[model samples]
Target chain A: SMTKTWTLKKHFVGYPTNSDFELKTSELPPLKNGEVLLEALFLTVDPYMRVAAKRLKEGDTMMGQQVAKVVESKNVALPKGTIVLASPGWTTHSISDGKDLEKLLTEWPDTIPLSLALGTVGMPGLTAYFGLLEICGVKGGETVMVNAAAGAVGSVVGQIAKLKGCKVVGAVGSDEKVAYLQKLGFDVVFNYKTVESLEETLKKASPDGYDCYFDNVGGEFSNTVIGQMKKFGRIAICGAISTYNRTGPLPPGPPPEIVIYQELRMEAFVVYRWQGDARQKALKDLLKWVLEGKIQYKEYIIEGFENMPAAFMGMLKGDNLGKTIVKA
Target chain B: PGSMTKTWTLKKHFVGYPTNSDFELKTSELPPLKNGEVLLEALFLTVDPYMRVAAKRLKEGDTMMGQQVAKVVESKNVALPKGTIVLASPGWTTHSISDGKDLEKLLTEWPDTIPLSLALGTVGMPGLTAYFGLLEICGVKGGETVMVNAAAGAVGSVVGQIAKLKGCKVVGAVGSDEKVAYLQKLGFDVVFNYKTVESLEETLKKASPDGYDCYFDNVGGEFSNTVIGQMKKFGRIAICGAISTYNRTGPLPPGPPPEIVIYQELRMEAFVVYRWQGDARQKALKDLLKWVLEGKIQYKEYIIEGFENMPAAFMGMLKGDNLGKTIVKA
Candidate 1:
């Protein structure tokens, strides 16, 4: 048996180019005690890979997480056909010790697609859940603004905020994405790319201004949003996808005057911070909501193991809407 | 009593920098106290960084906004009797009339050796600003390191001294060597002259290699931009005021993007001391008073004798000439 994997050919500069990656095939080794042999089901692509590339070295395999089917098990814990989540990067198939694997919750429904273990029922959903519910401390009756509002995390954020009775305003890059968000029950939807003025659009949407901002796209957009925040506003900095590739002397952040006058609080977090009962509760909540059809999700999937780099590059370029996944 | 007082008013709105020519001392006759009114004679007036922003609010001929420690020389109000000292916002005037709504009486336990002028400095607004910002906003804990800019000024000095009293490591940055020496004697763990440092990042890293757990930002703009990158994970930044950027004609220059803010998981919050009230506010004030009486928090004042020097003293304080609080004694 063999595993096909993608590796970095060179360090990234400006925007990542196709020449920066190389795909290789490797033979699989025999598994040992407490080990499981897995075949790739669905691999994920996200914006963090681009920003996180600064830590990668040349000739290193691109880092990512995936939901794989445990085809063979050396230990008694995992039987064949069981699925688990693991971080084996951009490989088509790999072997893992049971220690690094997280078995699907026993309650996972057969009606739910297993690929969602990397999307709505996984990291992205958890990101939106905690970022909106825990970090932003979002409450009913408050107006919320979430940018990149049709992507994996952003879509879940908008839906969850609406479910909680918040007046949700979402910003996207394309016309179709904006319309899709409207169907998802967002109170306000605007294509930030097409809008003449982000400031005016934000103002006209909620005349009183936003109380909580779930910021996935930072840079000049965030600077403008800072001005439109209400008194005692809360900002959750989940990502800065817009500024990830830019190099050398970026635009300035919001000045102190507005923050002091508004008395705003800004905090950034990664999903890894939540653990124990809270993490399980969030996952269970997401699963229950999805099963009830209360929370809606859409996926942009590309078939074939060879498409990992294409999926990643497209996601970084804002080419795909919702979760971008590669199915082998 | 028939009395006329000298009052300084804004002669011209400040453009880039303020000067003595921007102020005019006008003599004004006092009117008889109406019912529920009292006459307050200024003992000491304070010049602060917030006054720079205050300048934008007043018209060219309006009296400059300021606070003072005053004595109630005449009164028609029954609640406050004659010779009662109070803290009032009467602007830059030797005497003014009040309806008692804007007055807070000084603590009756005030001792004689400690100057009453402290009510305008260490024991009053500046001290309380440091207390609430460090304890409530920053939530500084013991054993963690703190970084404070303008570490010899009124609020900044109090911030470092309080951090020391809390058993935390303090890294201070000031403009002058003498300012550094002054804080050095006050048990500051580390103090540096930011003006003479070869590179601020290098100097800061050398001072606290583990990185700061909390940063009290008094000077803003590029300095804060550099300091934000050096914070430890989950660090808190208490922004009191942007003293450095107040004089900038163009927009203040930008700093690192939100990636830095996200990578370190930093919390940057701006606070106005006025937000603190009730038990929290009084607890901070009483703690400040207790520390002063015990010499746990020592204070120094850059006294500009006479109220006529209000403008000059303000200019000097903005120029970094004061080692501690800047006060104009009447």
Candidate 2:
């Protein structure tokens, strides 16, 4: 029986050229007593993967979380045929005692597609849920502006904002993505490339000024949004993916003059801060929405375990619409 | 015309930076006291920062402004004796007659043991400013870090000590080393000369490593921006005065909320001490009186010898020359 699986070769830089990654098969160590062995059912592609790579090392297996079926177990809690989620990071199989399985599962048991474990029902969904409600304090009748509109977190954030009775506006890189957001019930969706300036476009889209700004792409885009905030506005800074791959030191942008004039508030958070029982709360809420059809989710699945790098590259290039996943 | 040789009159309206062109002191008549009136010989006069802002809101022919502690040498009123001390706001004049309306109101509320000058300094306007700006506006809590700029000035000195009494870690920034030493003696945990430092942001961050939770601002413009930047998340700022921007030819320079407010989640509010009305005034005076009796609050007086020195005292305070409160003895 094959005990070896593919592992990562090196870290990637800007746009991740083909040579940036290598996939090689390696032998797995035998499991000791009290340990469990699992086979991968699906692997996930997320925006954090690209952003986190800047801090990752060469030859380190690229980070990722996946749903696996327990094939053998000495620990009674995880038995053979039991489906458990684990973050084995871009591999085909994993050995575990289920110690750090925080982002491991959805609330729904016997799920139809295990890929949902990595998308709207997983980390990205939790990011949207908490980032929108907790940091921004999004309330009814308010306006919220989100960047990366058609991606995993953006799509879910817009829908959730709508559910909360907020006026949602999204900015994406292309016209097709803008249409996708419109069909998903976004109040205002714009192709950022078609605009003269982000501040002018955002002012026209949200004339009253955005009460809440969820910044996923940092740099000049964020600086522009800062100029268009209303009094006492709230900003939730999730990621600065735009500058994540730059080769040199990032320049200090203009000071936030408007934030002081308007008395705006901002906070940055990582999902790890809200772990343990908080994960259960996120899964329960997401599972309820999925079953009721209240949530509209899109999946771009690349078949076969060997194509993990391709899925990661596609998501990083903004080529995938919605949650991109791999069917192992 | 009997006392025309002794009085001074307003020359011209102060149009921006107050200078000799902005004011003219000329002699005036000391009118005789009428029924229910008192003849006041000015013993001391007060010139404050509020005079500048108030001048902008004043008409061209209004009396040159000041608040005074005067001695009544002649009286037609029943309650005030000839040798009595009274507080008055008939400004910049050597001698004057009061009809007893403004004085009658003050006498009824004046505290004993502390002189009437305290009515204008520690127990009066500046006292009420420290009260409302710190306790009410900042809502200062025990064990929280509180910071004030212009720490040796009338309102700031009181603010630092009051914040100290509330069990807060108080740090003050001033322009001179002497002022920093004075604030430290007042129990401020940290005090720094802002002029000696390369950057206010670096100095404040090092002084209060945990970040200031509440900022009582006296100087605005770049100083305010630096403090706002160094504040912890959800910090509150009380905008009492923007002394830096008060003399600007244009609007005050662009400031913090533009970029970091959203990220830092700060709260900035502008306030006037009078907004709280009599209830806030009485509460402040009550606490200030207690602190005075307990020796918890110490005060310094910059008393200029004559009423003609109002301009000099006023200029000195504006130039950051006063150690504490500036007053004019008429």
Candidate 3:
């Protein structure tokens, strides 16, 4: 069998370029006992890929997660035609021993689209779930401010905050995203780009000050927002998407007196850190919310196996409205 | 007999670092004590970093804010009898009139060998701050590495000693060679003069190769920015004061990005010492008195004579001219 993969052509500096990644093909080896040949069905292109790629050198297979279908299997537990979620990089086909396959493969609900296993019902959704509920400890009637409010994790965060009976304020990059989040029950949505002053706009919108901050974009944006947080406010530092593409170390923001004066608590975490029972609970609740029309998801899907690199690059450039995915 | 009181009043708001021109010593006549009121003769007056920030909220002509150990000279309320020592916040004054309801009595079951001035120093606000800020906020465990700035000052000195008692390796940063030597004598595992260090980050890295687990921060601005980057995962920072930024008018200098806090899973909390006073303070006072009696916790006071030199002493303390607690003896 033949497999096509995206490999790192060079280290990325500042913004990533098309030439930084190369499409390569390699012949697959014969499967051993308890091994399966998996074909890519859906792949994820996320912001974390930008951060994870920094540790890789040239010729490394680009790191990512994909949903794959079993094309051939020697193991009885993994039958041919079973679909599973796997971290097989940006590849068209992969061979995996079924030793840990059960852990990765999702018994996805038949009523829901399988693409969701890579999106709203997957890593991004779980990140939003635990990051807000556990880290921020959102309470009803408290004010929540989320940046990157239209992105996959952030959109879900705002909606979940609303569902928990909290007031939701979002800072997004575009007016269209602002409108989209507003339709999704966000109380206040602002285009961070259009606003003359972030501090002023945030203070005016949340005159009482935020009790919880679901931070996705870090830097001066968070520095200003944090200054306006109420005493004992909680901040979940889910991602620093704003500084992920910078060539060098991130520059310092404003001195963080708010954390001192307000006695704020801030924490950062990756979703996988809460993988066992927490992931299962979050996924179950998210699925139920979606089925009940209490939650909505938008997927920006790009077609073809070769377009994985383009999908990732586009996602980095903020080209996607929601969860960015590629179908192979 | 009528008693005349001398008080230091603010003449002008402090712009940057405070000077003598911002204050004016004024004399006042004390009225006859009411039924519940008590007359107090000031004994030891404390000068702390909070006064610098608290002055920003005071109007011109207001008495400078401060805490003092005073003696009750006359009291209609027999509960606070004449010659009893009490803690009061009566500013820089030679004589004060208190209602006796809020005055904290200093003559408890504590040993008389412990200096009465310690009521304004180690067993007082700064000690309580170090105790709760370290034990409660930091939740420091044995074998953890702890770092503190302003290590020779009142609060920082106590913090370093307590961390040592908790079996943690303590590293401290000070402003002078004298303070560095002093902190070393007090059992700090490593001490550095931050002003002279070529690179604070390098010095700190060498001091604790494993990275700091708890940070008792008194000096903020660039010093905190550098130390924060060297924090271990799940490190806790207890911000007691930002003396470095107290004298500045410009926006606070940018520090390390919040991304570091996220990446390291650090937790930083700021608190006023009095918030933990009810239970934590009592426990701290008992432990501190026991430690001092056992020759474990040592205290130093730079005492200035007379009420007239209070402002100069305060300004000098801010300039790092004194070690331990800076107090005015009237």
Candidate 4:
């Protein structure tokens, strides 16, 4: 028996290249006690992979998460044919212990697709759930601003803010995304690329100013948004996708006086920071919303395991409209 | 009969730094008090950094705004008797006519040992600003590293001392060597002269290897930029004053990127002491008075002789010539 994996070929310089990754096949070893062999069903390709690449070396397995099935299992709890979530990276087959396998809800709702386990109903959904409600502490009637508003986390954030009775404004990269987000109940949607000046556009869009900012694209855009934040405004920094590709030090933007006078608070967090009980609660709420038709999600799927690197590169270039996924 | 009052009037708007020419001494007749008014004779006047920026908003010939410790020489109100000291914001004037409503009693117990002038410094506005800004805004905990810029000045000095009493490590950044030594003597864990240090970031990193948990930012601009970069995760900044940019005519210099604030999870807040002036002020004043009496806190006053020299003393204090509070006795 054999399993195929994508291995890092070289360190990425500026933009990641296809040659930076190599697909290799390896012979599978016999499973030990408490271990299970997983057949990859759906693989996730996200922006954090670019950030995680910095700490990785050549020939390391490209890190990612996937929804897999237990084809052969020695573990008692996760028997054969059990569907579970695993962090087995970019692989078609994985050997994992029961320790790394997350049990899928036994009474999984039939209305939701199983592929969503790798997306909206999964990690990204939980990220948006806690980052908005817990970190930002957004209240009703408050204006909430979010960047990358058409993507996985940002899209969820906008709907959640609207559900919480907030005036939600979203900043996207294209006119298409702007129009799409407007249909999703976003109060104001702007294409950051088409705007004459982000500062001017933000001011016009949010005359009352933002009380909470869910930042996904960090850099000058965030600096300008921060300038427009009201007094005691809160910011939850989830990702810096704009700066993730840069090879040099980040450019300085805006002075400290803006933050001082406005008395703003900004916090950065990795979603895994709240894993234990919070994860279950977030998934429960997300499932309820999806079942009630209050929440909607999208996935941009690229078929075949060999196109993983291409999908990742395309997603980085803003080609995808929603959660970018690879079907292995 | 009426008394003549001498005041330092604003002669012109300040350019780069304030000078004696920006103000002129003028004498005016102090009219008799009305039914509810009291006559306040200035004993001590405070020169603080806020006055430099505040002067920009005032028209030429307006009396300079400031806090003063005064003696109630005469009163139409029966509650305030003659010879009782009170806190009044009558500006840099020798005498004032107040309605007695805004006047606060200086010392309820009339402590003979404590100087009456302290009602304007240690136990007054500056003291309360430091106490509330540090404890309330910073929310500092024991063993946390605290950094304060302009640490030899009124508010900064008191902030470092209070943080020390809370068992936090105190780091002070000052301009002159003398100010550095003064901060060290006051039990600051680390004192660095900002002008003399090779690299502000390196000095701060060496002093607080774990990074500052609380920052008391008094000097804004580039100094704040460098200090903010060295802040630890979940750091809190008390933006009390910005004396550095008060002298500049143009826009503030570029500071640290906003990404740092996000990555470090830092919270920067600005506060005016009077906003929390009810019970918080009274409790802080009592604590400050007790600390001063117990030799836990030290106060240095640079006193000038006459009311006419108030402008010079204020300019001098802004130039970092004074160690602690700068006051002019009239």
Per-residue lDDT of B1-330 in model 4, one digit per residue for the tens? 487898888987776566444578998998878897888889989888899888989999999999898888887888888887888998989899998878788656547778777888778888888898899999976888899988888888889888888898999998899998888888899999998989888999999888889999898888899888999999999999888788764457787789998999999999998988677777888999988888888878778888877876887777677888788888
True contacts kept of each: 0.00, 0.00, 0.00, 0.00
Off by over 4 Å in 1: B1-330
CAPRI band of model 1?
incorrect
Q: Give the higher-lDDT candidate: 1 or 3.
A: 1
Which regions in candidate 4 have their CA more than 4 angstroms from the true location?
Answer: B1-330
lDDT of 4 by residue, A45-143 (tens): 999898888888889899999988889989888889998899988989988878777876666877777778877788898888888998898778889
Predicted candidate 3 versus true structure: per-residue lDDT over A1-328, tens digit per residue: 9999999986664446555679999999999999999999888888888888889989999888888899999988889998888887999999999765533335455777688887778889999999889998876888999988888899889888898999999998888898888888889999998899888999899899999999999887888988899999899999988787753345566576657888888899978898677778899889888887777888889998788877887777567888898999
What are the candidates' individual DockQ scores? 0.01, 0.00, 0.01, 0.01
Chain A TM-score vs. truth, each candidate: 0.98, 0.93, 0.96, 0.97
TM-score of 2: 0.49
Please provide, for model 1 over A1-328, each residue's C-alpha lDDT reduced to its tens digit, 9 standing for 90 to 100.
Answer: 6889899986664456555689998999899898889998999988889878788888888898998888888888888888889888889888887888887767998898887888888999999999999888987888999999999999999999988989999999889998899888899999998799989999999999999999999888999999999999999999988777663345787988998999998999999899879988999999999998878879999998787787887687677888999998
What lDDT tens digits, residue by residue, belong to model 2 across residues A1-328? 2543444444542445334567766766787787788888888877777678767667777778888888878877767887777887888877886785543443455654777777888878888889998899887898999999788888888888988899998999888899888988899999887888777788889889989998898877888888888899899998887765553345456476766788989899987678667767877888788777767889888898777776776676667898898888
Model 4, position B146: C-alpha lDDT score: 91
Docking class of 4: incorrect
The per-residue C-alpha lDDT of model 4 at residue B329 equals 85
- Of 1 and 2, the candidate ahead on TM-score is 1
Across B49-137, the per-residue lDDT of candidate 2 in tens digits comes to 87777777656655667777777888888878798877787767777888877773343445576666666787777878888888878
RMSD for all candidates, in order, please. Answer: 24.6, 26.3, 24.6, 25.4
Top candidate on lDDT is: 1
lDDT of 3 by residue, B1-330 (tens): 487999999887765556555789999998988887899999899988889899989999999999898888888887888888899998888998888777888637768787788888888888889988999899987888999988888898989998898898999998999999888888889999998999998999999988999999998988899999999999999988899888764467887679998999999999988887566578778888888788778978889888888887877777687899898999
Q: What's the C-alpha lDDT at position B117 in model 4?
A: 79
